[PDB]
Amino acid sequence: MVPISPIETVPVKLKPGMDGPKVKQWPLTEEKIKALVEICTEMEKEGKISKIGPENPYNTPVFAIKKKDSTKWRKLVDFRELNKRTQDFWEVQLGIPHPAGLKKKKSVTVLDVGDAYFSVPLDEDFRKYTAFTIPSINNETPGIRYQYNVLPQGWKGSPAIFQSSMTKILEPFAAQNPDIVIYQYMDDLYVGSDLEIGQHRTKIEELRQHLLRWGLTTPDKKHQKEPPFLWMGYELHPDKWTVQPIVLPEKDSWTVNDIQKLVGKLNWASQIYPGIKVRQLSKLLRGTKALTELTAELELAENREILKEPVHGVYYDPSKDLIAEIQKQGQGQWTYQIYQEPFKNLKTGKYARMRGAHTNDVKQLTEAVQKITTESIVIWGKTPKFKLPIQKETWETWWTEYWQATWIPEWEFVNTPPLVKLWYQLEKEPIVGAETFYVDGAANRETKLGKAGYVTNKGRQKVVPLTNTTNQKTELQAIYLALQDSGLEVNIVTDSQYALGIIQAQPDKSESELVNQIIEQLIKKEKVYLAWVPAHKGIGGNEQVDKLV
Amino acid sequence: IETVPVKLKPGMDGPKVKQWPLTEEKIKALVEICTEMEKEGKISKIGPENPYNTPVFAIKKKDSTKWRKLVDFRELNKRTQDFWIPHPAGLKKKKSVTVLDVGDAYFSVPLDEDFRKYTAFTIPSINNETPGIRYQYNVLPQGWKGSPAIFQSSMTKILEPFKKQNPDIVIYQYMDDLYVGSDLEIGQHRTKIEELRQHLLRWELHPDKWTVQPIVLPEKDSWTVNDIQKLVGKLNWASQIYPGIKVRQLSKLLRGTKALTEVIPLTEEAELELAENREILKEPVHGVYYDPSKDLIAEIQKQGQGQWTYQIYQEPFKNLKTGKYARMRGAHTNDVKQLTEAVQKITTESIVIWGKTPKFKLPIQKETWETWWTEYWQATWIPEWEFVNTPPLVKLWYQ
Numbered sequence: 051m052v053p054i055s056p057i058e059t060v061p062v063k064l065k066p067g068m069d070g071p072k073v074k075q076w077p078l079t080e081e082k083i084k085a086l087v088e089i090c091t092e093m094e095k096e097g098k099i100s101k102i103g104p105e106n107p108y109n110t111p112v113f114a115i116k117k118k119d120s121t122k123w124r125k126l127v128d129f130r131e132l133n134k135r136t137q138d139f140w141e142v143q144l145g146i147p148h149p150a151g152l153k154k155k156k157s158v159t160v161l162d163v164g165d166a167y168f169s170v171p172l173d174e175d176f177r178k179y180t181a182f183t184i185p186s187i188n189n190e191t192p193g194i195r196y197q198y199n200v201l202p203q204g205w206k207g208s209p210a211i212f213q214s215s216m217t218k219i220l221e222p223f224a225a226q227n228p229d230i231v232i233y234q235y236m237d238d239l240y241v242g243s244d245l246e247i248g249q250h251r252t253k254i255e256e257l258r259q260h261l262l263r264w265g266l267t268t269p270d271k272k273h274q275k276e277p278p279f280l281w282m283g284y285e286l287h288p289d290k291w292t293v294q295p296i297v298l299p300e301k302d303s304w305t306v307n308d309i310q311k312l313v314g315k316l317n318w319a320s321q322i323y324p325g326i327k328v329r330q331l332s333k334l335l336r337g338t339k340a341l342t343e344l345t346a347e348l349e350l351a352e353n354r355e356i357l358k359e360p361v362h363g364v365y366y367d368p369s370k371d372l373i374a375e376i377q378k379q380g381q382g383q384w385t386y387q388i389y390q391e392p393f394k395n396l397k398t399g400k401y402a403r404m405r406g407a408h409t410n411d412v413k414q415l416t417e418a419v420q421k422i423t424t425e426s427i428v429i430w431g432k433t434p435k436f437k438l439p440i441q442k443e444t445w446e447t448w449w450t451e452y453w454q455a456t457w458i459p460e461w462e463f464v465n466t467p468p469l470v471k472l473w474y475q476l477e478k479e480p481i482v483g484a485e486t487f488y489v490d491g492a493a494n495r496e497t498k499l500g501k502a503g504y505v506t507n508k509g510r511q512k513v514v515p516l517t518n519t520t521n522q523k524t525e526l527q528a529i530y531l532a533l534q535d536s537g538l539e540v541n542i543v544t545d546s547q548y549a550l551g552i553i554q555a556q557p558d559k560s561e562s563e564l565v566n567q568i569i570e571q572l573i574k575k576e577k578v579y580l581a582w583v584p585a586h587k588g589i590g591g592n593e594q595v596d597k598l599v
Numbered sequence: 600i601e602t603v604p605v606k607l608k609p610g611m612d613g614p615k616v617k618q619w620p621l622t623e624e625k626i627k628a629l630v631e632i633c634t635e636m637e638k639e640g641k642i643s644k645i646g647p648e649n650p651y652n653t654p655v656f657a658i659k660k661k662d663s664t665k666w667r668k669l670v671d672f673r674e675l676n677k678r679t680q681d682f683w684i685p686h687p688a689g690l691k692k693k694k695s696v697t698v699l700d701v702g703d704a705y706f707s708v709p710l711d712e713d714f715r716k717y718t719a720f721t722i723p724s725i726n727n728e729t730p731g732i733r734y735q736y737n738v739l740p741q742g743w744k745g746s747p748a749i750f751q752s753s754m755t756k757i758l759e760p761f762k763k764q765n766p767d768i769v770i771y772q773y774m775d776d777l778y779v780g781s782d783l784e785i786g787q788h789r790t791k792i793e794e795l796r797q798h799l800l801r802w803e804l805h806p807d808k809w810t811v812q813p814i815v816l817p818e819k820d821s822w823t824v825n826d827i828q829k830l831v832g833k834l835n836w837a838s839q840i841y842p843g844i845k846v847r848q849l850s851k852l853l854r855g856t857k858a859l860t861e862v863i864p865l866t867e868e869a870e871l872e873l874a875e876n877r878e879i880l881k882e883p884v885h886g887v888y889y890d891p892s893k894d895l896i897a898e899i900q901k902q903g904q905g906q907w908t909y910q911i912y913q914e915p916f917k918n919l920k921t922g923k924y925a926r927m928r929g930a931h932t933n934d935v936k937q938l939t940e941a942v943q944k945i946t947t948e949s950i951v952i953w954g955k956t957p958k959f960k961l962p963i964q965k966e967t968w969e970t971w972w973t974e975y976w977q978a979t980w981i982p983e984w985e986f987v988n989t990p991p992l993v994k995l996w997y998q
């Protein structure tokens with residue numbers, strides 16, 4: 051009998067002010083009661099549990115669920131109340147590794163630990179609260195009473211405590227064997243090395259002996275898992291990886307739950323499949339929080355054609371440069387590919403414009419860059435070099451004149467149309483020899499009726515009356531009218547802080563048709579100088595009188 | 600060497616703050632730093648029974664090519680129990696002030712064994728491959744509000760000899776930094792600082808002329824319509840700050856639908872109204888006082904060509920401090936490096952003037968700032984901030 055090293059128990063307490071779980075045992079069939087007693091008796095022999103006296107006041111229900119096969123019954127303990135009453139543990143395995151991050155290893159072995167939670171002891175002081183009772187047959191005897199001596203499956207602390215224990219044991223072996231790379235995830239271990247398959251399977255055995263010293267079971271038999279490995283909905287292959295097949299439901303009538311399931315399934319496909327877009331379906335979801343409830347459908351039918359051809363991703367090589375390329379898909383949609391070698395994509399993806407009233411392409415590309423940047427630092431611990439469909443001169447003009455501060459990391463122009471551009475550019479000084487339009491607009495709140503127009507320095511004038519409008523709508527129309535009726539160069543004076551704030555944000559597309567018409571006018575002008583004055587101060591040409599009448 | 604009792608504020612649990620992604624070299628930097636801190640007892644590894652967490656990252660201070668560890672103790676500091684020194688008004692009035700790092704001193708003092716579970720941080724792993732290394736501080740941690748307050752007694756004893764030697768040298772402490780001022784205006788102040796350096800081993804900023812820079816109006820021999828229109832707009836804005844500003848005579852010049860580039864001669868009445876407004880803006884603002892119970896607000900505007908303006912206030916139009924920052928520092932091509940340096944200079948000025956930091960209103964989208972500001976940050980503290988997404992029309996007026 052060689053000595054097993056002890057696993058140090060994690061000290062566990064309950065949430066403050068909670069005594070513990072006192073929940074009555076559910077009624078059970080005689081066959082279920084018998085089945086539970088057989089399982090528990092074996093476990094008590096194993097040391098997983100021990101019988102407890104009447105002193106313990108805490109109890110958690112137990113149920114029996116039967117897999118028809120082997121007429122077999124499995125014990126299910128419901129710790130939900132003790133889970134609510136148990137302390138908070140450190141955030142554990144938030145997120146999962148992404149396949150494009152894995153480097154290539156000549157040999158890779160996967161070991162799944164068995165009865166892992168039961169191989170790790172529980173803190174003696176907390177065992178009192180894991181108590182359950184097996185009802186007696188006919189309820190003519192006191193029910194059998196048990197407590198756990200190890201980490202119960204389904205308990206709150208079991209995953210966190212297991213992973214902490216597993217790391218501590220693994221740390222020495224990894225330092226001793228730097229050539230191997232070991233990854234930890236849940237009840238599995240991924241060991242990879244560029245070693246010859248001989249020395250690899252040798253160190254795999256050495257690691258298994260190392261776990262034996264602390265009493266951890268491992269698959270010594272030729273591991274049932276062999277490449278390809280299916281892991282977290284990924285198909286993993288020695289030189290390639292891809293997403294496990296995606297199932298998009300087909301129904302003449304699609305409930306809201308299917309669109310919520312179809313949009314997420316499309317997002318998952320987008321990490322390796324280029325050109326996936328779920329914008330039209332997500333718009334249908336909006337305004338609806340109920341499961342029971344298509345223009346768009348051609349793009350969704352196009353997604354099925356895209357998903358019909360197989361697409362795979364490569365693994366990451368730290369020696370080569372990391373590169374990301376972005377394309378404008380239209381309707382605020384962006385598509386990107388991250389790769390190190392041409393046509394060999396580690397991963398792909400999409401970006402959707404944030405919910406805004408106005409916007410432009412340069413801002414959206416900037417946001418796409420930030421997202422890819424954060425995603426890449428997560429996955430590869432570095433920022434990629436960017437290939438971007440914007441001229442250097444265009445980005446230079448934008449950031450030097452944008453009122454906000456902005457930055458894009460190292461990048462280069464790629465001439466893959468459509469190219470992001472600045473559609474219009476306001477002047478910074480008034481234009482000599484350009485006619486000056488003083489504009490104004492106003493509406494009556496009660497009647498919703500108003501006027502918009504202008505007076506100019508050459509005596510040109512116009513006032514147009516309007517039906518279903520507001521002060522903000524009229525102020526914009528006035529500017530719009532000045533643009534329609536002026537030459538290619540024009541000075542426009544307004545008092546609307548609302549309009550200047552819209553124009554000074556430089557949209558190239560908008561929700562309001564009035565804003566987009568102004569944009570279309572600005573694009574046609576050679577020079578436009580937009581100046582602001584305070585209203586009702588008697589500035590000349592500020593004909594509030596004409597539009598208010 | 601006796602740990603002092605510390606607890607959280609009543610009704611407040613420890614900080615539970617998500618750690619954000621770090622580049623590989625910053626992870627490698629922190630691994631080297633925290634391994635050595637373990638050997639020196641500064642920190643010790645911890646387990647999953649600790650649900651608390653505070654973000655940590657790495658920076659390179661100027662004059663060094665060695666990584667440094669910064670912990671974002673903002674959430675802990677706000678949840679930390681308030682600890683029971685009036686701010687030195689002389690420091691802002693002193694000709695020259697020098698800033699020193701006293702953070703290493705805190706590591707000699709043990710931390711109360713009960714409070715350490717609240718100083719938990721996590722070195723992250725790339726791609727969630729291995730779980731993060733979790734530590735907790737065994738000694739007083741840099742960046743914590745309780746670290747200067749607990750060490751105040753020791754520091755008072757350490758610098759009591761130097762203070763008696765030089766009673767014209769001001770001393771102030773904020774976080775892990777020591778602020779030493781003087782009216783000496785001597786290059787020997789640099790050596791006298793070396794005297795304070797060795798004295799610490801045994802055991803350059805100068806105030807701006809104006810707290811609030813004046814509002815100025817152009818002086819011209821010929822005015823255009825556009826010139827008079829921009830003037831009336833500025834004066835109307837200043838009328839919110841200053842009482843007697845009048846725009847009536849200048850607006851009467853604008854009468855008629857005149858072309859923007861046309862020159863208007865000023866009347867004698869219009870000249871007078873502008874001179875009376877000049878005189879109004881020469882005087883200081885009326886009844887502007889600092890309340891230590893209120894927050895300071897700092898707004899920054901990007902002016903172009905590496906120039907940045909800012910104003911510090913508590914009540915709008917009652918500015919306690921305004922100023923402008925230009926730089927030849929290695930930030931000409933990067934707007935975010937400029938803003939981050941600007942945010943640092945303004946917060947330092949804020950520490951000197953009131954001994955507290957302001958809440959910034961930054962002219963930048965959140966996602967851009969959050970992705971990059973740690974790349975250029977060099978200070979042991981971190982202020983608070985929010986994001987301005989609507990362009991201010993006032994930008995021209997501060998220029």
Ligand SMILES: C=CC(=O)Nc1cccc(CCOc2cc(Cl)ccc2Oc2cc(Cl)cc(C#N)c2)c1
Binds near residue numbers: 158
């Ligand atoms: C016959 C050759 C062969 O099969 N080689 C091979 C197969 C797949 C991938 C790789 C390269 C990346 O794989 C790893 C890389 C490192 Cl450095 C460490 C552990 C790795 O394996 C992991 C990783 C994860 Cl996160 C999850 C899983 C699972 N399930 C397996 C190589």
